[PDB]
Symmetry: D2
Subunit: 260 residues, 4 copies
């Protein structure tokens, strides 16, 4: 997998999965624009890449805003000459049962996860469709693109929706040499998780080990957290694939949680 | 069973098409049926039809994109009929364009009507269904495009896919309250619009069998009756055995 | 309603198959109960006839081509037609793959899958005639869609049934033959009634809710009635709209 | 990733086609490769091809329907190379007929080669992979027909569907022993058989784009390289993150 001469935009990439994707794509030779609401956050990642010998810039962008997305993607295209790869990535999670789920929270969840994917896609296609130069568009989904959990109606709905948009893009983008994919990570261990574990142990009245192995990773086959590296490697594989053979497909990266 | 005597149902987007047939069929099976639609006259007409035919119905004006309007409208159903046992969340708006020309305004309108309308009406219905764990059935009207894409329909396909996710979460949250969830996914229905599209688009019979219904096994349009009978079956099912499932009513277009 | 219709249900001396037979008979179908055990078959047929239905028992080794063909032809000769075939088996043999006997493997595939293939083949001889048509239903499992450890033979066979059904939906269409797969979740058998208290040691409520039904939304066993009503619904559906589809009847264990 | 230096692989059905190309790619990546096939001469030829290009390979005669032959053959891999790290179970035999004319003999041969062969080689490989929980990767070669049906292919579609079930069970059992499982599902590959059918079946261009690849998004044949690159990526993956999953390599024919 080599991306020398390629240009990539990764959104929500100041941290976590999106940051590791950015790092991995740059390592592979891609020139990478790290887009995030926080320009300083984006810059820190870009600075890490440049220090390691790669090529990156940080781009401030509210992905729910058409104007900010269009301008920012065009800025990338101007700096780098193209946009070969778009990775649309958001991780914001707001939980609540449906009967208590705020409509404001609901709308913000759809806007960030899905409108952000729609807008950045639309903006990237303006450049990818030019003379059918082509491109790869990857949405970061979840096992929750495929399977539900209680208290996560907004997130599960959004992640399900991302599959539909990607599948339409695969049929529309083919004649312009644009491929689409969805990558669906399982449970990643975070500082938040580290705090949620003892909480749920006390509330449920079981051990923290049972919270990890049975509550959180009970649907995995091995009781192992998914790593950002797992995810980034799969994105790299897709980004560098030599044909459109995998277009429209989703890839579940979850240690056996939901098997398709 | 499928008998719904003493049951109460609300069907959104029900002034015409699939929604109206579902409303007629539920009423025929004994249910008190509230016809919710953006257009009050359209809703009343269906309710009049049901009443004149010996059923029991009301019309309700409802903008399903508007929280207040949904809450008030659903509350009127409970006020009139005593409860809300069945919610059928139905919308058919279709705006087509390739993604690069898809207007953000059209995008947001599509998601608001199809998905936010499902979320708002569900939230409102659960207030009544969850009381004393009385229970209920919530049915979302999806599409084969809940499962498969077609070009030029990014907004619709994205919304219909999202409906599955909402339904599957509801299935998990609602069980403790005796609320079931389902999605009914019709294939290609021969609507008055399609009727116009057939001569305009090889002869018409080729347009139908090859162009429009080429992914079916038999070249037969899905009927509003096929859909309504499936909705009726789910509405009257004696246990939560089918909760969380989607039901593809498409003559073999997408088999799972 | 299934008046003047004829059904064959295999593996039907007990359990799910037997309830399916009873229910189809109740609906007005003439039912042939096929089973390796002719006495067991007869018992179900006797119970139907006593209730005012019409039924016969037929001995049949569904893994044997000659026995299946002869048996189906005999049903068709006696009743005048074969309108509905329900292919049903429940044999379960568990072992980890590395210790899974090849003999056990072949017997599992023969009963579950070869049985479906052979009975289907023999029934199509009659359904294709004059394009009379028919409905073919395979009894799968949630294990048609999702795996469990120690059940490689069963899961493989039940996954395979989906493939066969989906081919039959495409081929059968021109002859008015529909196919479906019904996929039950965990059913409470006398065997399960015995396993619950022992696994409780090897809470009862915990064994039921967490160990056996932890993947359901409500911790409720699927009933044979749940299953039978779904088969009835498909058998009597007024078009081919549901052909090729599977129906998960599991209380939310695997949602599609 | 994707380097396999010091790894050992066995590929069945590998004298030609997808199997051969997979074998070539694994060896290029540094794996020691055993070419297993019914024809010893065919297996040797691929082995000689690998060895001359700088790789390391042996030929193994194996009838995958035969438990003794499989056990012996897999043992020969371990004996020559010290281990068995990767198993790729591959078979492409296709026999077409409509179900009512599908020979039971052909049916049983299809299932024995595609599915029993996967079961037998898997079971033989686990004896080595489970030793001290050394671990390994088992990849079954499926098809889009693991997921979707075509007419006249009941036996193939059934087999390929069933392979999913076996892999998913293996994913669950194998994890504690560090064994991963996957299924790679190729779409329409342009074989010499295909090469002959295109001019036979109005324009050649029309036959390719509409008749054969009408369900792709781009009208492009899947290549043996597309398939082999995917197998390689799975074979070298640094964790069990992708275990139990299937990978559809089909240019948009069936999207999930």
């Amino acid at each position: 997998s080599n991306l020398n001469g390629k240009t990539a935009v990764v959104t929500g990439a100041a941290s976590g999965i999106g940051k590791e994707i950015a790092l991995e794509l740059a390592k592979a030779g891609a020139a990478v624009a790290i887009a995030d609401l926080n320009q300083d956050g984006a810059n820190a990642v870009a600075d890490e890449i440049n220090k390691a010998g790669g090529k990156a810039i940080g781009v401030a962008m509210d992905v729910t805003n058409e104007e900010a997305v269009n301008t920012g993607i065009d800025k990338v295209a101007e700096a780098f000459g193209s946009v070969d790869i778009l990775v649309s990535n958001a991780g914001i999670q707001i939980v609540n049962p449906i009967e208590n789920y705020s409509f404001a929270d609901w709308k913000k969840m759809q806007a960030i996860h899905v409108d952000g994917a729609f807008l950045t896609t639309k903006a990237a296609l303006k450049h990818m469709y030019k003379d059918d130069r082509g491109g790869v568009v990857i949405y970061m989904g979840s096992v929750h693109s495929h399977e539900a959990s209680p208290l996560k109606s907004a997130y599960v709905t959004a992640k399900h929706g991302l599959l539909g948009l990607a599948r339409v893009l695969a049929k529309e983008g083919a004649k312009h040499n644009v491929r689409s994919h969805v990558v669906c990570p399982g449970f990643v261990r975070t500082p938040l998780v580290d705090k949620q574990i003892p909480e749920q142990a006390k509330e449920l009245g079981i051990s923290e080990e049972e919270v990890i192995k049975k509550v959180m990773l009970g649907n995995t086959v091995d009781g192992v957290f998914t790593t950002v590296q797992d995810v980034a490697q799969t994105v790299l594989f897709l980004s560098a694939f030599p044909s459109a053979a995998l277009t429209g497909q989703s890839f579940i990266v979850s240690h056996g949680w939901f098997m398709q």
